[PDB]
Design an enzyme around this catalytic site. Structure first.
Site, short mmCIF file in Angstrom:
data_model
loop_
_atom_site.label_atom_id
_atom_site.label_comp_id
_atom_site.label_asym_id
_atom_site.label_seq_id
_atom_site.Cartn_x
_atom_site.Cartn_y
_atom_site.Cartn_z
N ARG A 15 33.29 -170.48 19.78
CA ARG A 15 32.36 -170.01 18.75
C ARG A 15 32.11 -171.18 17.80
O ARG A 15 32.68 -172.26 17.97
CB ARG A 15 32.88 -168.78 17.99
CG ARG A 15 32.16 -167.46 18.38
CD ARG A 15 31.94 -166.54 17.17
NE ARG A 15 30.94 -167.08 16.24
CZ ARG A 15 30.93 -166.85 14.93
NH1 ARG A 15 31.86 -166.07 14.39
NH2 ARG A 15 30.00 -167.40 14.17
N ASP B 185 39.38 -165.64 13.79
CA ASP B 185 38.74 -166.90 13.41
C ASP B 185 39.64 -168.12 13.51
O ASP B 185 39.22 -169.18 13.95
CB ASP B 185 38.20 -166.80 11.99
CG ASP B 185 36.98 -165.91 11.89
OD1 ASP B 185 36.12 -165.99 12.79
OD2 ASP B 185 36.87 -165.15 10.91
N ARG B 186 40.89 -167.96 13.08
CA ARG B 186 41.79 -169.10 13.01
C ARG B 186 43.08 -168.86 13.78
O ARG B 186 43.82 -167.91 13.51
CB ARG B 186 42.09 -169.44 11.54
CG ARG B 186 40.82 -169.77 10.75
CD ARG B 186 41.11 -169.97 9.27
NE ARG B 186 41.63 -168.75 8.66
CZ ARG B 186 40.88 -167.71 8.30
NH1 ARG B 186 39.57 -167.74 8.49
NH2 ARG B 186 41.45 -166.65 7.76
N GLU C 130 29.65 -173.95 4.86
CA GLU C 130 28.96 -174.24 6.12
C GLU C 130 27.61 -174.96 5.98
O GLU C 130 26.59 -174.49 6.49
CB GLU C 130 28.81 -172.95 6.93
CG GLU C 130 30.18 -172.32 7.23
CD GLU C 130 30.09 -170.90 7.74
OE1 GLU C 130 29.02 -170.27 7.60
OE2 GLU C 130 31.10 -170.41 8.29
N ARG D 76 25.31 -172.25 2.74
CA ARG D 76 25.48 -170.81 2.68
C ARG D 76 26.21 -170.44 1.39
O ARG D 76 27.34 -170.86 1.18
CB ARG D 76 26.26 -170.34 3.90
CG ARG D 76 26.89 -168.96 3.80
CD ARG D 76 27.65 -168.63 5.08
NE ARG D 76 28.48 -167.43 4.98
CZ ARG D 76 29.17 -166.91 5.99
NH1 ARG D 76 29.12 -167.45 7.20
NH2 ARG D 76 29.90 -165.82 5.80
N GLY E 80 24.24 -165.39 -3.63
CA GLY E 80 22.94 -165.92 -3.26
C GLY E 80 22.42 -165.52 -1.89
O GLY E 80 23.02 -165.87 -0.88
N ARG F 206 23.11 -160.06 12.36
CA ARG F 206 22.94 -161.32 13.07
C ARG F 206 22.25 -161.08 14.40
O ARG F 206 22.81 -161.34 15.47
CB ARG F 206 24.30 -162.00 13.24
CG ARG F 206 24.95 -162.30 11.89
CD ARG F 206 26.36 -162.85 12.03
NE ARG F 206 26.85 -163.37 10.75
CZ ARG F 206 28.02 -163.97 10.58
NH1 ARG F 206 28.85 -164.12 11.61
NH2 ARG F 206 28.37 -164.40 9.38
N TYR G 232 25.35 -168.15 14.02
CA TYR G 232 25.21 -169.36 13.22
C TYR G 232 24.07 -170.23 13.73
O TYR G 232 23.73 -170.19 14.92
CB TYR G 232 26.50 -170.18 13.27
CG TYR G 232 27.60 -169.67 12.36
CD1 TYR G 232 27.50 -168.43 11.74
CD2 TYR G 232 28.72 -170.44 12.11
CE1 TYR G 232 28.49 -167.97 10.90
CE2 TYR G 232 29.72 -169.99 11.27
CZ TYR G 232 29.60 -168.75 10.67
OH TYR G 232 30.59 -168.28 9.83
CA LIG Z 1 24.75 -164.93 0.86
#
Ligand SMILES: [Ca+2]
Ligand SMILES: *[C@@H]1O[C@H](CO[C@@H]2O[C@@H](C)[C@@H](O)[C@@H](O)[C@@H]2O)[C@@H](O[C@@H]2O[C@H](CO)[C@@H](O)[C@H](O)[C@H]2NC(C)=O)[C@H](O)[C@H]1NC(C)=O
Ligand SMILES: *[C@@H]1O[C@H](CO[C@@H]2O[C@@H](C)[C@@H](O)[C@@H](O)[C@@H]2O)[C@@H](O[C@@H]2O[C@H](CO)[C@@H](O)[C@H](O)[C@H]2NC(C)=O)[C@H](O)[C@H]1NC(C)=O
Ligand SMILES: *[C@@H]1O[C@H](CO[C@@H]2O[C@@H](C)[C@@H](O)[C@@H](O)[C@@H]2O)[C@@H](O[C@@H]2O[C@H](CO)[C@@H](O)[C@H](O)[C@H]2NC(C)=O)[C@H](O)[C@H]1NC(C)=O
Ligand SMILES: *[C@@H]1O[C@H](CO[C@@H]2O[C@@H](C)[C@@H](O)[C@@H](O)[C@@H]2O)[C@@H](O[C@@H]2O[C@H](CO)[C@@H](O)[C@H](O)[C@H]2NC(C)=O)[C@H](O)[C@H]1NC(C)=O
Ligand SMILES: *[C@@H]1O[C@H](CO[C@@H]2O[C@@H](C)[C@@H](O)[C@@H](O)[C@@H]2O)[C@@H](O[C@@H]2O[C@H](CO)[C@@H](O)[C@H](O)[C@H]2NC(C)=O)[C@H](O)[C@H]1NC(C)=O
Ligand SMILES: *[C@@H]1O[C@H](CO[C@@H]2O[C@@H](C)[C@@H](O)[C@@H](O)[C@@H]2O)[C@@H](O[C@@H]2O[C@H](CO)[C@@H](O)[C@H](O)[C@H]2NC(C)=O)[C@H](O)[C@H]1NC(C)=O
Ligand SMILES: *[C@@H]1O[C@H](CO[C@@H]2O[C@@H](C)[C@@H](O)[C@@H](O)[C@@H]2O)[C@@H](O[C@@H]2O[C@H](CO)[C@@H](O)[C@H](O)[C@H]2NC(C)=O)[C@H](O)[C@H]1NC(C)=O
Ligand SMILES: *[C@@H]1O[C@H](CO[C@@H]2O[C@@H](C)[C@@H](O)[C@@H](O)[C@@H]2O)[C@@H](O[C@@H]2O[C@H](CO)[C@@H](O)[C@H](O)[C@H]2NC(C)=O)[C@H](O)[C@H]1NC(C)=O
Ligand SMILES: [Ca+2]
Ligand SMILES: [Ca+2]
Ligand SMILES: [Ca+2]
Ligand SMILES: [Ca+2]
Lengths: 388, 388, 388, 388
Positions: free
Chosen positions: A37, A70-71, A198, A212, A217, A289, A324
């Site tokens: 990924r 993820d990790r 990122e 990002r 935001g 996504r 992404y």
């Molecule tokens: Ca955002």
């Protein structure tokens, strides 16, 4: 002999064109393909390459079960021929990493590789294959970086790094690194930017990063950087926002601060400033996504009442999964060509992807000063055919 | 043109950082990966490489059954991209060998490959891919060598070789080899060293080797060597011992002889002298090949009442399997960077690894003059998922 | 720039040492390995390579069934890293061929590839990857060649070719080929040689070929050749014969004609002249293709009452299958090192190899001026573990 | 440094000889091989390569089901070692494409890659790995190109492109492209040519293209082109036609127009002008894509009463499946050697190929000024052995 890459301007362009596509999940049906990924692309003098964070397991094997995580210590930054599926017979392992950035300075590759415990991670700097330096977590909260290519000008490479909370105030820095040695870092000014993750960067004389904001935001924060310092910061002015989630068009024109609407979380994305205009990649969905499109917003880079989406290319339909996305450049004589990749995530936690693993394929597009046609280039896997 | 490697000093360092990890057993779940053991790492001008003794079988196939056996005609020294799993599509076969050492002299690779009957083995010397010389067993009792990289200075490569009993007095030699041709050998003085196996060597002006006493020493024997002769010998003074098995800390300070406690057998390991201090790799367990840590012992290289473990990095938890470990160097401008690999053995005879084969994965770390973070990087395979 | 290879003398040697071994059948248990036979080895400036005639099928698949068949359109000469198993991810296809020879002239590779109908075959000459010339079958009866490396001196390559009956008088020629272009050929004189097949050649100032008489000779016919013409012919004088089948030792001393005992068929083999002495490879069995040994016969090259087997190395036991064997050379400064390969055939029609396919692994040895040890390096496959 | 390829004359030749054969379907029995179609061959200074349009799936997997479909987003132009089967471990992805052409200009590779919607496709021009230019569909009806190698003279590459109906009047153009940048295009004159598809081109001083009239011509249309313009057009005069379908021999001599008999559809094919004579590839069947032969027609290039098939080589029997075929050249000192490939299609919709996929293998032949032998080199797969 090869000179260091120079501060070239971005090439002129008026549309994006299909480049390389790996079809990695389709090709992984028989368990040949490495689970990945957070892919990206970066090129040297001779080749463009795919990079991604592998999961230390083959797609569809028992070890691929639960790779939504993820990790892990079993993640490595790997490199493979652009547009090819990553397999044991073609991949190279760059470094142990669960977050990374790579860039070529004209002579050698540099990589930034984070691994270790969430509270005590370190970033290893690799240059010409040798570990040359490191960054120790200073906020002890998931030290992390771009997940796409860094940029190098006249031998000095620039990379954005974050340590701290995902949905609160954290520390964001830029590091300047020369021949693998950290020269200096700067804390990103918080006069405008409130959260930064990122970064997707490119070169247009100076380095531009569009990142990002994972907190407040729905618009994307950005920086302009040279070989010495951060020159400028802000949020993309476009009243058409490009994070996910985000408000429907049209939204707020916020050049200097986060929108404060649909603020968290977000997704890695990119953009390209073009004069006073801006090109922005984004999911088709405003909540998920799914899908991918790129819009050109007239005067979208500046404070203006004249923002209009003059161009919209729909590259992956809203019925297909995305993920992404990030910028990369290709040297084109006296200018840099803007290109991008799109990660096409399949598996958990995507609705109806009934498998136990999480992975992705890749598709890429480059900018030309010609009018594009149209098409649809999604992952293309029938999840029902896949080993679970 | 490339010059021969020079006698550079070791680089300054204050901690070790995660480099490459192959996850070979995890990736071998679908029977793609070659069965190996006794891995190591060594680099040339362009790349670092993994080396290992293959078993002439794929992991999880019927032929992998019983690969606990140390010496067979079906073992070859193989080479594969560092951090990648060894597969048929990426490996190179260097030579037939059930014991080996490899090193790059600045121009070409040299390899030392032992094979044949236990009582009548021979070591083939390979240089630039050509078999250039050989050593005939002289004690007729398992002629054997380092199982990690040799070292080369100004064109002359040095390698430690043993022939004789595993738990009694044997012959230990160093061979000097130039462009694949044996120049001379020396019997290692037995004024201090009583037993010597599996030397892990590096360069710090001179060649330093830290080895395995398999007989009476829970402390590790060591040698200092240049392009002409053995300069110095001894045992590592540190009262914190680093073989396995070994007594609990603190133990005896024995600079000039074996500890005489928990003396046999042992495990291949490494260390780095740093001024009067010494860094020592070791299993976490004092009895088994589980876990891996590296300690820095203040004044550990010398006779002193001041030995203290100033640093302890736990890199593989005691709940995870380890194995052999060894040093390698990477040229870093005007100094050599100290790095090491750790073999992570899975399968027989490890308790609860219920499979019929024996193999390993690899993890590696390099030294930097920066403060490290912390993490855990074990093999990571669920043995229950594996073909038996 | 690279010069053409020169007419160097053979290096001094007094024994043979284990070099590379592929374990291809063992590694083929999971159907990754390409079916082959008639392998050989040949080297360029940078690498030694394995070559073999593939069967256009993977070992253990349904298409591998019946690959005992010698000539099909689906056979290609392939090349793969020496000592590695041939797999789809590592092989190169050189040309369509069911008989072949390859050699490097110092600058480029030349290959000779026969294919087509038994009665109408043609040999394609490949040079630097380009098809440069051809030979049309003139006796219309299985045009065929060495199945091991040809030799090149000062830019002119030499290769032995046969067309006609397997067990009667046929035509045997040598072709001289420069940069892929046929310069001339000569019919081999029949004043001594009566039948000639599968020449194994090497360089010792001139080219020496030791071949297979498939008709009347249990002793091996030989030729001495330079860049212009055939200089000398005969049979190896040694009263210890080296074809298979053959009479038990001691047999007839026949320098000038076939033995006329146990004359047919035969097996491809090799030898090395050493002063007045000769080294001869041969199966251990006098009737079957089992085992492999190499003997040195004192004064075996000449007419003498003093023939004695001064040396005998048993490299593959008579309990293990062998097959074809052939010479190759490696440039060693001012001399050529003599090496050889042994084909280890598994499958049909070997007794108790209960599978439907026919293939092989490879083992290789090189000559050094040192005393050897001893060992056993057979195929090593448990045929019972294999897909049939 | 390398100069641009020059306008060399075609080499003399009098027959075609078997070169490389991949046996890709046979080798794909265990699901290792990538599904392809529309293969071709093209060479650079160092290597000849296979190219093909992959289908983003492995042969015999569920995703291979239905790959008879010509255009999908999951098709990429891929490249693999000539004569090898395309597998994940050896392929390179050149670009996203469902129609393509590739050619080497002496310095770098150029590729033309069409993808996207049938009504809105675009052709990406790749040069030295960088996307340098593009063509937007102008008739909005399957913009498409040669499916074999383009040609480059003195740095200017030439490629034939079509947009419009398959069985009615469309637009046919030639594009001149230098270093990846479109210099100019010309609409092909319709004074003689009425329909043009899938040009197979080569160099004989000028570029010659022999193509496919898919509408009214059972004879093949052709063009002669230099670095500046289209010099000449027509149909091959030979009264022995070479499209499929086509009338039985002898048919009409039509130098200046389509035959108007058995006009549609057609199959990609090739030919070579040789003085006033012409060599023509063609299926053995006059109705189906089975078998392959090449004929030489005396005075077949010109208007003459003397057309006779002086030579006929049957390379694939009418009992075996063929498919597309195309020309490629190999530099041979001061002339270009004429070679060709034949696509051997297996699967749907071939009668009795009872599988759900569609793919192909490849076989190739080159021209020499020698007399050929004879043989048969078909796909060779037993479709019954294959995964469906
Ligand atoms: Ca955002
Ligand atoms: C950083 O790079 C500059 C050269 O790049 C220019 O200045 C940058 C800040 C940025 O604006 C680029 O786009 C510009 O092209 C280096 O400046 C050179 O320094 C040397 C040594 O003093 C001097 O001889 C040259 O004249 C300078 N070149 C120019 C064009 O002014 C500068 O050294 C770099 N800084 C670091 C820390 O590496
Ligand atoms: C993917 O894995 C889950 C979890 O697997 C369990 O826990 C793992 C850490 C490992 O130890 C496995 O051996 C365990 O089975 C699977 O979910 C389990 O499925 C089993 C069998 O149906 C069920 O009995 C358990 O209750 C489940 N456990 C949990 C925590 O849900 C799941 O089936 C796997 N997916 C696939 C496609 O195999
Ligand atoms: C061995 O190497 C030396 C050079 O290395 C130095 O001396 C070593 C013993 C060791 O202490 C290194 O760390 C030192 O850097 C060679 O000495 C050279 O010999 C030539 C020929 O006589 C002479 O011209 C040079 O002056 C010498 N160089 C130095 C620095 O003294 C020596 O030849 C090497 N020995 C062998 C057997 O190869
Ligand atoms: C691993 O191998 C052992 C031993 O295999 C036996 O001996 C080998 C040399 C070979 O000839 C095999 O064919 C033999 O089976 C296996 O242990 C055997 O298992 C069988 C079947 O359960 C049993 O009947 C035998 O008594 C066992 N033999 C011994 C000596 O213990 C073992 O099962 C294999 N392991 C795996 C995972 O397959
Ligand atoms: C063949 O090679 C010779 C050189 O090799 C020598 O002669 C061979 C017959 C053989 O005995 C080798 O071992 C010898 O080393 C070439 O002879 C040269 O020819 C050129 C041109 O006439 C002349 O200038 C040189 O002096 C010659 N060299 C020697 C050493 O005599 C000969 O040309 C080659 N023949 C062909 C057909 O290529
Ligand atoms: C290897 O192949 C033989 C022959 O296969 C038959 O003929 C082939 C050309 C092909 O068309 C196959 O489909 C045919 O089956 C096999 O021998 C046959 O085995 C079958 C089934 O047991 C039997 O009924 C036939 O009589 C046999 N035919 C002959 C000529 O003996 C053999 O079983 C295959 N071996 C393996 C290990 O699969
Ligand atoms: C196209 O190529 C020519 C050279 O090739 C020759 O002319 C072609 C039209 C064709 O017939 C080939 O087979 C011929 O070999 C280029 O002509 C050169 O132009 C330069 C600059 O004016 C001049 O100095 C040279 O004398 C010319 N060379 C020759 C042999 O006449 C021409 O420039 C090319 N055109 C383009 C647009 O690239
Ligand atoms: C190849 O595929 C066809 C079609 O598959 C169906 O539609 C696909 C798009 C996909 O969604 C699959 O899951 C579907 O099964 C297969 O034909 C079907 O076969 C099934 C099972 O026998 C049958 O019930 C359906 O009616 C068939 N559908 C159609 C449209 O014919 C076919 O079996 C596949 N071939 C192979 C060798 O697997
Ligand atoms: Ca011990
Ligand atoms: Ca005989
Ligand atoms: Ca496989
Ligand atoms: Ca037609």
């Amino acid at each position: 002999f090869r000179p260091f890459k120079s501060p070239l301007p971005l090439c002129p362009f008026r549309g994006f064109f299909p480049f390389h596509k790996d079809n990695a999940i389709r090709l992984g049906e028989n368990k040949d393909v490495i689970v990945t990924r957070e892919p990206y692309v970066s090129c040297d003098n001779d080749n463009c390459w795919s990079f991604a964070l592998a999961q230390g397991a083959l797609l569809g094997t028992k070890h691929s079960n639960g790779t939504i995580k993820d990790r892990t210590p079993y993640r490595s930054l790997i490199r493979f021929p652009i547009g090819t599926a990553p397999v044991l017979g073609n991949y190279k392992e760059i470094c142990i990493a669960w977050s990374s950035s790579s860039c070529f300075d004209g002579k050698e590759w540099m990589h930034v590789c984070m691994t270790g415990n969430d509270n005590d991670a370190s970033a290893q700097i690799i240059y010409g294959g040798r570990m040359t330096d490191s960054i120790k977590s200073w906020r002890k909260d998931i030290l992390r970086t771009q997940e796409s290519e860094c940029q190098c000008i006249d031998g000095t490479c620039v990379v954005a790094v974050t340590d701290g909370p995902a949905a609160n105030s954290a520390d964001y820095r830029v590091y300047w690194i020369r021949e693998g040695k950290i020269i200096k870092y700067e804390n990103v000014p918080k006069t405008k930017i409130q959260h930064l993750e990122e970064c997707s960067c490119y070169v247009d004389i100076d380095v531009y990063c569009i990142c990002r904001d994972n907190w407040k935001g729905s618009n994307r924060p950005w920086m302009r950087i040279n070989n010495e310092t951060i020159l400028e910061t802000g949020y993309v002015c476009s009243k058409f926002h490009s994070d996910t989630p985000r408000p429907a068009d049209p939204s707020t024109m916020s050049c200097d601060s986060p929108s404060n609407v649909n603020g968290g979380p977000g997704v890695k994305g990119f953009g390209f400033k073009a004069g006073d205009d801006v090109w922005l990649g984004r999911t088709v969905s405003t909540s998920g996504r799914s899908g991918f499109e790129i819009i050109k917003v007239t005067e979208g880079w500046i404070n203006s009442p004249n923002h209009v989406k003059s161009i919209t290319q729909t590259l992956v339909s809203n019925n297909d999964w995305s993920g992404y996305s990030g910028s990369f450049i290709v040297k084109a004589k006296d200018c840099f060509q803007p290109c991008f990749y799109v990660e096409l995530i399949r598996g958990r936690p995507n609705k109806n992807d009934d498998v136990s693993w999480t992975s992705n394929s890749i598709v890429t597009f480059c900018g030309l000063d010609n009018e594009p046609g149209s098409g649809n280039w999604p992952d293309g896997s029938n999840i029902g055919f896949m080993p679970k």
